Design an enzyme around this catalytic site. Structure first.
Site, PDB file in Angstrom:
ATOM      1  N   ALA A  87      -7.700   2.934   0.096  1.00  0.00           N
ATOM      2  CA  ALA A  87      -7.930   1.486  -0.044  1.00  0.00           C
ATOM      3  C   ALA A  87      -7.720   0.222   1.511  1.00  0.00           C
ATOM      4  O   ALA A  87      -7.794  -1.134   1.200  1.00  0.00           O
ATOM      5  CB  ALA A  87      -8.975   0.588  -1.028  1.00  0.00           C
ATOM      6  N   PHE A 146     -18.851 -20.254  21.285  1.00  0.00           N
ATOM      7  CA  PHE A 146     -18.717 -19.541  19.834  1.00  0.00           C
ATOM      8  C   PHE A 146     -18.014 -18.287  19.688  1.00  0.00           C
ATOM      9  O   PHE A 146     -17.609 -17.375  18.908  1.00  0.00           O
ATOM     10  CB  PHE A 146     -19.839 -19.322  19.166  1.00  0.00           C
ATOM     11  N   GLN A 162       9.762   0.628  14.237  1.00  0.00           N
ATOM     12  CA  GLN A 162       9.265  -0.656  15.335  1.00  0.00           C
ATOM     13  C   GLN A 162      10.287  -1.651  14.086  1.00  0.00           C
ATOM     14  O   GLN A 162       9.473  -1.875  12.981  1.00  0.00           O
ATOM     15  CB  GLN A 162       8.166  -0.851  15.173  1.00  0.00           C
ATOM     16  N   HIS A 170      10.318  -5.468  13.617  1.00  0.00           N
ATOM     17  CA  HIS A 170       9.753  -6.991  14.055  1.00  0.00           C
ATOM     18  C   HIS A 170      11.025  -7.762  14.664  1.00  0.00           C
ATOM     19  O   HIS A 170      11.392  -7.584  13.719  1.00  0.00           O
ATOM     20  CB  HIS A 170       8.730  -7.541  12.614  1.00  0.00           C
ATOM     21  N   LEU A 228       6.908 -11.347   6.416  1.00  0.00           N
ATOM     22  CA  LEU A 228       7.186 -11.720   7.738  1.00  0.00           C
ATOM     23  C   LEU A 228       6.050 -13.685   8.448  1.00  0.00           C
ATOM     24  O   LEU A 228       5.764 -13.969   8.146  1.00  0.00           O
ATOM     25  CB  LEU A 228       5.282 -10.463   8.310  1.00  0.00           C
ATOM     26  N   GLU A 257       3.584 -13.182  15.393  1.00  0.00           N
ATOM     27  CA  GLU A 257       4.011 -13.112  16.764  1.00  0.00           C
ATOM     28  C   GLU A 257       3.131 -14.292  17.399  1.00  0.00           C
ATOM     29  O   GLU A 257       3.603 -15.103  18.643  1.00  0.00           O
ATOM     30  CB  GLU A 257       3.919 -11.756  17.703  1.00  0.00           C
ATOM     31  N   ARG A 293       7.700  -5.681  22.501  1.00  0.00           N
ATOM     32  CA  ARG A 293       8.674  -5.157  20.487  1.00  0.00           C
ATOM     33  C   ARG A 293       9.746  -4.841  20.493  1.00  0.00           C
ATOM     34  O   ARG A 293      10.759  -5.433  20.629  1.00  0.00           O
ATOM     35  CB  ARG A 293       7.390  -4.636  19.619  1.00  0.00           C
ATOM     36  N   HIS A 341       9.051  -3.030  11.049  1.00  0.00           N
ATOM     37  CA  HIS A 341       8.009  -3.115  10.401  1.00  0.00           C
ATOM     38  C   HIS A 341       7.109  -2.293  10.500  1.00  0.00           C
ATOM     39  O   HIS A 341       6.517  -1.554   8.773  1.00  0.00           O
ATOM     40  CB  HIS A 341       7.480  -4.261  11.688  1.00  0.00           C
ATOM     41  N   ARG A 354       4.541  -0.273  19.202  1.00  0.00           N
ATOM     42  CA  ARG A 354       3.165  -0.562  18.886  1.00  0.00           C
ATOM     43  C   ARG A 354       3.163  -2.202  19.324  1.00  0.00           C
ATOM     44  O   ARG A 354       3.958  -2.652  19.248  1.00  0.00           O
ATOM     45  CB  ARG A 354       3.076  -0.819  17.815  1.00  0.00           C
ATOM     46  N   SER A 369      -2.929  -2.112  15.293  1.00  0.00           N
ATOM     47  CA  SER A 369      -2.460  -1.567  14.142  1.00  0.00           C
ATOM     48  C   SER A 369      -3.881  -1.643  13.624  1.00  0.00           C
ATOM     49  O   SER A 369      -4.569  -1.013  13.137  1.00  0.00           O
ATOM     50  CB  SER A 369      -1.934  -2.169  13.700  1.00  0.00           C
TER      51      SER A 369
HETATM   52  C1  LIG Z   1       3.494  -5.597   6.549  1.00  0.00           C
HETATM   53  C2  LIG Z   1       3.042  -6.424   7.889  1.00  0.00           C
HETATM   54  C3  LIG Z   1       2.169  -5.633   8.440  1.00  0.00           C
HETATM   55  C4  LIG Z   1       0.845  -6.078   9.405  1.00  0.00           C
HETATM   56  C5  LIG Z   1       0.938  -7.536   9.729  1.00  0.00           C
HETATM   57  C6  LIG Z   1       1.865  -8.127   9.227  1.00  0.00           C
HETATM   58  C7  LIG Z   1       2.420  -7.510   7.332  1.00  0.00           C
HETATM   59  C8  LIG Z   1       2.994  -8.399   6.169  1.00  0.00           C
HETATM   60  N1  LIG Z   1       0.214  -8.310  10.459  1.00  0.00           N
HETATM   61  C9  LIG Z   1      -0.460  -7.321  12.093  1.00  0.00           C
HETATM   62  C10 LIG Z   1      -1.250  -7.926  12.853  1.00  0.00           C
HETATM   63  O1  LIG Z   1      -1.727  -9.437  12.909  1.00  0.00           O
HETATM   64  N2  LIG Z   1      -1.860  -6.723  13.462  1.00  0.00           N
HETATM   65  C11 LIG Z   1      -1.681  -5.863  13.799  1.00  0.00           C
HETATM   66  O2  LIG Z   1      -2.266  -4.648  14.661  1.00  0.00           O
HETATM   67  N3  LIG Z   1      -1.019  -4.431  12.489  1.00  0.00           N
HETATM   68  C12 LIG Z   1      -0.380  -5.368  11.781  1.00  0.00           C
HETATM   69  N4  LIG Z   1       0.520  -5.380  10.795  1.00  0.00           N
HETATM   70  C13 LIG Z   1       0.595  -3.917  10.330  1.00  0.00           C
HETATM   71  C14 LIG Z   1      -0.730  -3.674   9.498  1.00  0.00           C
HETATM   72  O3  LIG Z   1      -1.097  -4.210   9.009  1.00  0.00           O
HETATM   73  C15 LIG Z   1      -0.820  -2.381   8.957  1.00  0.00           C
HETATM   74  O4  LIG Z   1      -0.583  -0.840  10.371  1.00  0.00           O
HETATM   75  C16 LIG Z   1      -2.062  -1.639   8.381  1.00  0.00           C
HETATM   76  O5  LIG Z   1      -2.283  -2.886   7.561  1.00  0.00           O
HETATM   77  C17 LIG Z   1      -2.397  -0.120   7.845  1.00  0.00           C
HETATM   78  O6  LIG Z   1      -3.383  -0.063   7.306  1.00  0.00           O
HETATM   79  P1  LIG Z   1      -3.302   1.244   5.987  1.00  0.00           P
HETATM   80  O7  LIG Z   1      -5.105   0.886   5.761  1.00  0.00           O
HETATM   81  O8  LIG Z   1      -3.417   2.250   7.105  1.00  0.00           O
HETATM   82  O9  LIG Z   1      -2.377   0.622   5.043  1.00  0.00           O
HETATM   83  P2  LIG Z   1      -2.327   0.561   4.096  1.00  0.00           P
HETATM   84  O10 LIG Z   1      -3.191  -0.912   4.247  1.00  0.00           O
HETATM   85  O11 LIG Z   1      -1.396  -0.200   3.404  1.00  0.00           O
HETATM   86  O12 LIG Z   1      -3.038   0.252   1.983  1.00  0.00           O
HETATM   87  C18 LIG Z   1      -2.763   2.179   2.351  1.00  0.00           C
HETATM   88  C19 LIG Z   1      -3.857   2.152   0.709  1.00  0.00           C
HETATM   89  O13 LIG Z   1      -3.195   3.973   0.066  1.00  0.00           O
HETATM   90  C20 LIG Z   1      -3.557   3.630  -1.218  1.00  0.00           C
HETATM   91  N5  LIG Z   1      -2.705   4.302  -1.435  1.00  0.00           N
HETATM   92  C21 LIG Z   1      -1.394   4.242  -0.897  1.00  0.00           C
HETATM   93  N6  LIG Z   1      -0.332   5.639  -1.563  1.00  0.00           N
HETATM   94  C22 LIG Z   1      -1.372   6.159  -2.198  1.00  0.00           C
HETATM   95  C23 LIG Z   1      -1.291   6.744  -3.349  1.00  0.00           C
HETATM   96  N7  LIG Z   1      -0.513   7.924  -3.399  1.00  0.00           N
HETATM   97  N8  LIG Z   1      -2.590   7.369  -4.526  1.00  0.00           N
HETATM   98  C24 LIG Z   1      -3.901   6.260  -4.095  1.00  0.00           C
HETATM   99  N9  LIG Z   1      -3.891   5.625  -2.847  1.00  0.00           N
HETATM  100  C25 LIG Z   1      -2.384   5.463  -2.502  1.00  0.00           C
HETATM  101  C26 LIG Z   1      -3.097   2.008  -0.993  1.00  0.00           C
HETATM  102  O14 LIG Z   1      -2.900   1.519  -2.100  1.00  0.00           O
HETATM  103  C27 LIG Z   1      -3.188   1.220  -0.141  1.00  0.00           C
HETATM  104  O15 LIG Z   1      -5.208   0.430  -0.684  1.00  0.00           O
HETATM  105  O1  LIG Z   2       2.465  -6.647  13.485  1.00  0.00           O
HETATM  106  C1  LIG Z   2       1.742  -6.861  14.636  1.00  0.00           C
HETATM  107  O2  LIG Z   2       0.773  -7.216  15.131  1.00  0.00           O
HETATM  108  C2  LIG Z   2       2.278  -8.242  14.970  1.00  0.00           C
HETATM  109  C3  LIG Z   2       2.235  -9.617  14.246  1.00  0.00           C
HETATM  110  O3  LIG Z   2       0.778  -9.526  13.481  1.00  0.00           O
HETATM  111  C4  LIG Z   2       2.764 -10.705  14.067  1.00  0.00           C
HETATM  112  O4  LIG Z   2       3.087 -11.433  14.744  1.00  0.00           O
HETATM  113  O5  LIG Z   2       2.271 -11.610  12.890  1.00  0.00           O
END
Ligand SMILES: *Cc1cc2c(cc1C)nc1c(=O)[nH]c(=O)nc-1n2C[C@H](O)[C@H](O)[C@H](O)COP(=O)(O)OP(=O)(O)OC[C@H]1O[C@@H](n2cnc3c(N)ncnc32)[C@H](O)[C@@H]1O
Ligand SMILES: O=C([O-])CC(=O)C(=O)O
Ligand SMILES: CCCCCCCCCCCCCCC(O)O[C@H](COC(O)CCCCC)COP(=O)(O)OC[C@H](O)COP(=O)(O)OC[C@@H](COC(O)CCCCCCCCCCCC)O[C@H](O)CCCCCCCCCCCCCC
Ligand SMILES: C/C=C/CC/C=C/CC/C=C/CCCCCCC(=O)OC[C@H](COP(=O)(O)OCCN)OC(=O)CCCCCCC/C=C/C/C=C/CCC
Ligand code: HEM
Ligand SMILES: CCCCCC(C)c1cc([N+](=O)[O-])cc([N+](=O)[O-])c1O
Ligand code: SF4
Ligand code: F3S
Ligand code: FES
Ligand SMILES: [Ca+2]
Ligand SMILES: [Ca+2]
Lengths: 113, 129, 588, 238
Positions: free
Chosen positions: C15, C119, C240, C242, C252, C255, C286, C354, C399, C404
């Site tokens: 989710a 806007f 990657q 960070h 985190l 950037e 990065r 990251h 990336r 992402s």
């Molecule tokens: C860690 C992070 C990453 C991040 C960021 C800041 C932080 C602290 N800021 C970003 C930004 O400004 N711009 C950007 O483009 N990316 C940024 N990132 C990275 C980004 O958050 C991630 O790539 C993205 O969130 C990934 O999304 P995704 O939907 O693919 O994954 P998720 O949010 O981690 O959720 C995974 C879901 O799957 C469920 N799950 C996992 N394992 C299971 C199992 N076994 N069974 C059932 N469900 C499972 C999780 O519970 C979750 O809902």
């Molecule tokens: O993963 C990224 O896109 C970079 C990011 O969120 C940040 O610098 O806060």
């Protein structure tokens, strides 16, 4: 629209409580101001204070405001604590009758002075 | 557990286990004060009834108020009533906008309230006497 | 036949940002679909995203998606597909504006101290782009996006199975994915979710290190389920780190700081990033900006203190107003974790793990691919992947910032828009014998009967440590070698690991254990890959091979599973597109 | 130093009634750590102890717990704030809600009320914008303090009115969220929304107790937002 609630809806209740609060605060001040300007209260001064059209009319407007206010009020409380329907309705009935009697007795006491 | 159906989850609700802000105490007392005052009116109406019925009545009331036990009760009624008016007004003020809805502003309102209540309560005691 | 079954025309495992964007799209198409998650949807790692979403909208200033391609391809190191990237960048705007119409709390433009415009989604300056193309809503762009998306699944009444743990995928006699098995964390019951399409969106798993920005949830359950099933993973060594992670915290910090005009300095007061990337400054890519600071620590010229060898991320110079308006989420994580008010003092930052660039190889339509006997791409029936768990080959080996999230929505939606068509193509898929289903229940049975085994904490702890030291920012053959072996040691160790809690009502342990296996298979693949590659590209830096092998290593390293049997490593690549594009010099 | 903990325990299949269990986690007196840190350690000593956790940085809302009588997030509540010599650190589940196990409460009723108020934009579609919607910074500013809610449920869990009418009174979180849409320039059903909240419970059970503001991790102020809703109601129904 809840049958026990005086108000047709929430907002109605909100208003009725705030309006009566106000009217009741004036009345209280009125009654307080008299006692704090009495010292030794004589039967002549007491009855003199009530034989007054003004005091009669204010006293009855208060009682009437209390019915509305205490009704909505006690109602909110019962809604929080008395969960068993049957019990709660009995209480509301006892309470509302009481409030109505307060007002009726008020009239009886007032015209009798 | 109904008939032939079991287990009902527990709930954390020990009030002695929960820490309540002054603002929470302020309002619950407003609720209690209200129920006290609901009853209070009857008592006062009764007295007022005797008081005006006739001279012998006004006498009988003047004397009931003489009991020091009664003086104590006539004292709480007015204090409960006083508490309720003050906190009520505090209430209505935030509603409209004569008081900030912030938490700090809230504790300050609450405190000033109790103070004015205590004061009025003292005055009430002087009257009952 | 004693195991319950829930049939759906689709099962979206996850989710997260992409998982919901898809579940939403798949639902819009009149397809029955079940969405699963380990935590409540609003708790997925995505909520933590800050920076913003980099898409060419033209608000802040006129722009075109192609500049977004150049800025990005060079950002990946020409290791990222032109076909995929093109599609993403081009489909960018429409997809994002779609989110605003959904109610996403974007920041707005018009009056500012020395700025002014209508806007539009406020686009902030960010890393890897010539100018500001990053749509950001405060410091909390992920929280905004995730929540909006959940509010959307509420509106369209998506079927959500919250706090369900997906175990392993279920294979068809013909070798197709036909649903999966999952554990109701609440009650503990196990169920087989049968589906004509199984979408994985389990995000990354940076938890295989000791210091990461990821959450305690990112254990790459996805990765582990794909390997244990027979599905490969592309560029699984590409990680990657960070540039501005909090020293000692691993939490985190955006950037966008540098984007709003943040300094990345050294104790001697110089802006070493100006000296490293002479004209691009702190906006440098990065991969690059990381080694810069990390290097200043190697030469004993890195700032120190209670938190540890850090670099000073000076921001205080910007107005306290701007910091509170633009980076409210930053001013707090610093105080809370770094014990330093950025309004007055720089932040103890350090490159920390990251985004995981590697993951399940897929077509733009989200479909999962494996190689043929000859080594040809062969799609996997009933399987799709979207988000961080997928290597559609968009970020390549680096990336670009804020892409992402752009990825999540685009290919998340791409997967949904194309689902019915894809099913048509694979056609019908046959049932599974209790044997097939029974198979998936193996990992679970093991843990539950083994109680005198070894304590997982150590195995976990070691696991992370090894990866931390041998597969850090800078690595070398001899290293991988050692770790690659330590791992085998541990992987066998893990086979006797025990499970103390055998309860039903919410068993946090059982779940964490089951996640450990994934941590294992994940870290493993990571290594065999890291070692394999003979070049220094994007996030991959070998002291033994300081230059990128344009002729030999200009490809996607495919990790070749066989479930728990013995491994293998292969290759892949994608130069063709529409507007064209050549490799080149990579100076940031 | 040493640390004496007092933790709420309960498991439907072993226990038949809750009990508080004693824990000692001898920690390095070096620096301060979050309550989550403690728990995670203690859970190594004792596996059975279950609780929710994730982002670890005060942003997911998972670790809501009542610590020494006050609700807050275990991921950001420093052991400093909860350590007093001779006395134990009492940690319990969030009040009012049903207990699934240990410190994990069923959040069902919480999310329910959230849905009741229609947590999503509603735009009749009349007058479609070329690209994005027209939102001036001044109009968007109005959302601040209303879109950062993380659904931790610390607020609602601290409100008596919510204890008594879990399903009738919407509660802090839900009202803060209702207001988020009531004042969103992009939302076109504000009058329809207000009619939906005019009953006796949905909004008017709030007595301005302010325990919600008191415990909100994100420093949000539901009381103030509820006050604005009430005002809208008066403008529309009087
Ligand atoms: C860690 C992070 C990453 C991040 C960021 C800041 C932080 C602290 N800021 C970003 C930004 O400004 N711009 C950007 O483009 N990316 C940024 N990132 C990275 C980004 O958050 C991630 O790539 C993205 O969130 C990934 O999304 P995704 O939907 O693919 O994954 P998720 O949010 O981690 O959720 C995974 C879901 O799957 C469920 N799950 C996992 N394992 C299971 C199992 N076994 N069974 C059932 N469900 C499972 C999780 O519970 C979750 O809902
Ligand atoms: O993963 C990224 O896109 C970079 C990011 O969120 C940040 O610098 O806060
Ligand atoms: C801003 C918000 C406003 C605040 C609102 C809060 C109100 C509640 C708080 C009450 C505060 C009362 C304050 C009184 C006061 O100020 O006392 C003053 C004291 O002032 C000082 O000390 C000076 C200090 C100055 C410092 C700067 C004056 O007091 P005295 O000196 O006269 O003392 C009495 C004396 O000993 C001389 O005493 P006595 O010998 O004359 O007594 C005789 C005794 C017996 O007489 C009888 O038998 C008659 C009884 C009649 C009872 C009537 C009840 C009416 C009920 C109406 C109900 C309508 C629905 O008399 C009693 O002791 C008198 C008791 C009077 C009680 C009055 C209660 C007020 C009721 C208002 C209506 C209630 C509404 C409910 C909904
Ligand atoms: C008889 C004497 C009692 C008078 C008490 C007046 C209240 C004084 C006050 O401000 O307490 C604040 C305190 C909190 O301070 P704090 O919030 O911990 O710190 C604030 C320091 N101002 O409040 C309390 O401890 C609860 C006080 C409740 C008073 C009830 C009024 C009823 C009158 C009946 C007579
Ligand atoms: C005739 C004497 C009075 C009686 C018997 C009475 C009784 C009550 C009761 C039973 C409640 C509801 C309890 C609760 O839900 O908290 C209440 C509430 C209230 N009263 Fe009174 N009251 C009286 C006088 C007044 C006066 C004079 C004011 C004006 C200052 C006032 C202002 C209020 C307010 C603002 C509330 C709202 C509290 C809430 O919504 O929680 N009351 N009253
Ligand atoms: C005699 C009053 C008992 C009140 C108990 C509790 C838990 C309570 C506490 C507060 N409070 O604000 O702290 C408010 C209400 N209440 O009903 O409004 C309430 O019922
Ligand atoms: S408003 Fe605050 S306390 Fe209430 S649910 Fe949201 S974040 Fe939690
Ligand atoms: S505590 Fe509850 S009563 Fe109102 S002021 Fe906050 S929602
Ligand atoms: S783990 Fe997310 S806020 Fe505590
Ligand atoms: Ca990826
Ligand atoms: Ca409107």
């Amino acid at each position: 629209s809840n049958a026990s609630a005086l108000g047709r809806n929430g907002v109605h209740d909100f208003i009725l409580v705030r309006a009566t609060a106000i009217v009741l605060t004036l009345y209280i001040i009125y009654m307080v101001g008299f006692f704090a300007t009495s010292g030794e209260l004589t039967y002549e001064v007491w009855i003199g204070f009530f034989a007054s059209a003004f005091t009669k009319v204010f006293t009855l407007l208060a009682l009437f405001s209390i019915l509305i206010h205490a009704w909505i009020g006690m109602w909110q409380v019962l809604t929080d604590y008395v969960k068993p329907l049957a019990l709660r309705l009995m209480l509301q009935l006892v309470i509302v009758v009481a409030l109505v009697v307060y007002v009726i007795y008020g009239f009886v006491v007032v015209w009798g002075v | 557990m109904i008939r032939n159906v079991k287990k009902q989850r527990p709930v954390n609700l020990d009030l002695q286990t929960i820490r309540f802000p002054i603002t929470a105490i302020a309002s619950i007392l407003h609720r209690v004060s209200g129920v006290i005052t609901f009853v209070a009116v009857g008592i006062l109406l009764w007295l007022l009834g005797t008081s005006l019925s006739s001279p012998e009545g006004f006498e009988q009331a003047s004397a009931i108020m003489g009991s020091f036990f009664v003086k104590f009760i006539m004292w709480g009624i007015l204090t409960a009533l006083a508490y309720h008016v003050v906190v009520g007004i505090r209430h209505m003020m935030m509603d409209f906008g004569y008081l900030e809805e912030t938490f700090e502003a809230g504790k300050r309102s609450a405190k000033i309230s109790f103070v004015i209540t205590v004061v009025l309560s003292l005055l009430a005691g002087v009257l009952v006497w | 036949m004693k195991l319950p079954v829930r049939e759906f025309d689709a099962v979206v495992i996850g989710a997260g940002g992409a998982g919901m964007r898809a579940a939403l799209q798949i639902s819009q198409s009149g397809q029955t679909c079940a969405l699963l998650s380990k935590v409540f949807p609003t708790r997925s790692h995505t909520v933590s995203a800050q920076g913003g979403i980099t898409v060419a909208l033209g608000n802040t200033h006129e722009d075109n998606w192609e500049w977004h391609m150049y800025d990005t391809v060079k950002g990946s190191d020409y290791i990222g597909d032109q076909d995929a990237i093109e599609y993403m960048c081009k489909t960018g705007p429409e997809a994002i504006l779609e989110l605003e119409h959904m109610g996403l709390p974007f920041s707005r433009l018009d009056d500012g101290r020395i700025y002014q415009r209508p806007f539009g989604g406020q686009s902030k300056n960010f890393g890897g782009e010539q100018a500001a193309r990053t749509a950001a809503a405060a410091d909390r762009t992920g929280h905004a996006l995730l929540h909006t998306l959940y509010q959307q699944n509420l509106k369209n009444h998506t079927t959500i199975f919250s706090e369900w743990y997906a175990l392993d995928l279920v294979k068809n006699q013909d070798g197709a994915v036909v649903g999966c098995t999952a554990l109701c964390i609440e009650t503990g019951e196990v169920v087989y979710f049968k589906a004509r399409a199984t979408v994985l969106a389990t995000g990354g798993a940076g938890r295989i290190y000791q210091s990461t920005t990821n959450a305690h949830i990112n254990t790459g359950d996805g990765v582990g389920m794909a390997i244990r099933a027979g599905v490969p993973v592309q560029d699984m060594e590409m990680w990657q780190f960070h540039p501005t992670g909090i020293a000692g915290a691993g939490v985190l910090v955006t950037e966008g700081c540098r984007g709003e005009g943040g300094y990345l300095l050294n104790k001697h007061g110089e802006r070493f990033m100006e000296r490293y990337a002479p004209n691009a400054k702190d906006l440098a890519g990065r991969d690059v900006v990381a080694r810069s600071i990390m290097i200043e620590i190697r030469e004993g010229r890195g700032c120190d203190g209670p938190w540890g060898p850090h670099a000073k991320l000076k921001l205080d110079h910007l107005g306290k107003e701007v910091l509170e308006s633009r980076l409210p989420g930053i001013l707090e994580l610093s105080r809370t974790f770094a014990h330093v008010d950025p309004v007055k003092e720089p932040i103890p930052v350090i490159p920390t793990c990251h985004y995981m660039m590697g993951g399940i190889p897929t077509k733009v339509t989200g479909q999962a691919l494996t190689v043929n006997e000859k080594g040809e791409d062969v799609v996997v029936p009933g399987l799709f992947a979207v988000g961080e768990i997928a290597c559609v080959s968009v970020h390549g080996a680096n990336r670009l910032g804020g892409n992402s999230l752009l990825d999540l929505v685009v290919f998340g939606r791409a997967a949904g828009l194309h689902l019915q068509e894809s099913i048509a193509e694979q056609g019908a898929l046959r049932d599974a014998s209790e044997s097939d289903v029974e198979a998936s229940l193996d990992r679970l049975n093991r843990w539950n009967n083994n109680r005198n085994g070894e304590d997982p904490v150590a195995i976990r702890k070691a696991l992370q440590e090894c990866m931390q030291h041998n597969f850090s920012v800078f690595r070398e053959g001899d290293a991988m070698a050692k770790g690659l072996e330590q791992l085998k040691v541990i992987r066998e160790r893990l086979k006797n690991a025990r499970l103390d809690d055998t309860s039903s009502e919410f068993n946090t342990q059982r779940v964490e254990c089951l996640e450990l296996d994934n941590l294992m298979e994940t870290a493993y693949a990571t290594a065999v890959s890291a070692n394999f590659r003979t070049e220094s590209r994007g996030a991959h830096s070998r002291f033994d091979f300081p230059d990128r092998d344009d002729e030999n290593w200009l490809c996607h390293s495919l990790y070749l599973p066989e479930s728990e049997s013995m491994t293998r490593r292969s290759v892949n690549m994608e130069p063709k597109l529409r507007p064209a594009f050549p490799p080149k010099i990579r100076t940031y | 130093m040493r640390l004496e903990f007092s933790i709420y325990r309960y498991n439907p299949d072993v226990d038949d009634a809750p009990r508080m269990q004693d824990y000692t986690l001898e920690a390095d007196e070096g620096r301060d750590m979050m309550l989550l840190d403690a728990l995670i350690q203690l859970k190594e000593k004792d596996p059975s102890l279950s609780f929710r956790r994730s982002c670890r940085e005060g942003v997911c809302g998972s670790d809501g717990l009542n610590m020494n009588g006050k609700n807050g997030l275990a991921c950001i509540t420093p052991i400093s704030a909860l350590n007093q010599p001779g006395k134990k650190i009492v940690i319990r589940p969030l009040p009012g809600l049903p207990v699934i196990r240990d410190l994990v409460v069923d959040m069902g009723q919480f999310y329910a009320q959230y849905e009741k108020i229609k947590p999503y934009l509603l735009n009749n579609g009349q007058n479609p914008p070329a690209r994005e919607h027209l939102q001036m910074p001044e109009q968007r500013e109005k959302l601040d303090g209303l879109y950062e809610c993380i659904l931790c449920a610390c607020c609602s869990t601290s409100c008596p009115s919510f204890w008594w009418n879990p399903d009738k009174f919407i509660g802090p979180a839900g009202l803060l969220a209702a207001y988020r849409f009531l004042i969103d320039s992009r939302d076109t059903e504000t009058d329809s929304r207000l009619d939906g909240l005019s009953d006796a419970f949905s909004v008017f059970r709030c007595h301005s107790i302010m325990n919600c503001v008191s415990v909100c991790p994100k420093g949000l102020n539901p009381t103030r937002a509820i006050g604005h809703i009430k005002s809208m109601l008066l403008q529309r129904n009087a």
